[PDB]
Amino acid sequence: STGSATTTPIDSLDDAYITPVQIGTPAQTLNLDFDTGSSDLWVFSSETTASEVXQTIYTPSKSTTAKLLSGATWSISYGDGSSSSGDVYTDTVSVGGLTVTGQAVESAKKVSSSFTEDSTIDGLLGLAFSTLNTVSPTQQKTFFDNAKASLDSPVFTADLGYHAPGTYNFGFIDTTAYTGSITYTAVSTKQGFWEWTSTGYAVGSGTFKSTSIDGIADTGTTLLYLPATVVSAYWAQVSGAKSSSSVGGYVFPCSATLPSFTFGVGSARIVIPGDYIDFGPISTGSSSCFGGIQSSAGIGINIFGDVALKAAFVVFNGATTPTLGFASK
């Protein structure tokens, strides 16, 4: 079996992407944030504190196939400080025509203010490794893990668009979606992430520097977070760029033409166009724009976020020994 679903940016800045997911019988359609940086499928629901709901909610009592997972609870917090918690049901879950039965659907009893305030996201669908799942006492498998048995191939691909819709595919590789060939690189699962090692970088038309950059492929993070000295080398090429403490990062004049940024994947090279690194104005009407490449120093890990991933076709190969594939597009 296979599945294919359209993913669309939640705003004009590509802050995040949402994908329709059908849950329960008859299907309830919710717009979820596909996150390869976490491993919980959790949704706004009829159980969520009313003052914390502004979103489409799941109602387990209206699904004939929902079953309560007795005594199971969950609690998650994310990099940004946002958090949620609740209890657990299993139910049928479909994505782009691919159906999984017995998928754990985490029902939020409470959500933090960030989730409340974002009307476009009804929940998150975790696609990292199941070791990161927060359900207790027994951790639950991700959608991808449950689907592997029936998939034509144990893969999923991410094709994110720049200010445009894209696609998540399950179980097959669309060879018309990319150019040239896919280069694969080893994944370490020791921390639960799709963690890999980039072979180096280049700024604009300059030299490629061979330097190991350990990072994670994370669809659930907006920007590209790299080591301080690598980010410094980028912004040194932009005459108006400076580090602003009040905005929290590198800002530059919106009118600048930004250089591209190249990262290595084995002996291959993925080039992020400069326009993609222009995240946008700090404020509507502002003449200053926020940079899409920022320092990872304060986060503790390098993150190849949406800024990087949307310049490529990305293959998440979930075979017993997982790898990550990248192709230009």
Curated annotation (Swiss-Prot):
S-S pairs: C254-C289
GO biological process, one term: proteolysis
Keyword Metal-binding: no
Keywords from the UniProt entry: Aspartyl protease, Disulfide bond, Hydrolase, Protease, Signal, Zymogen
EC number per UniProt: 3.4.23.22
Catalytic activity: Hydrolysis of proteins with specificity similar to that of pepsin A, prefers hydrophobic residues at P1 and P1', but does not cleave 14-Ala-|-Leu-15 in the B chain of insulin or Z-Glu-Tyr. Clots milk
Family designation: Belongs to the peptidase A1 family.
Protein name, per record: Endothiapepsin
Species in which this protein is naturally found: Cryphonectria parasitica
Portion of the parent chain present: 90 to 419 of 419
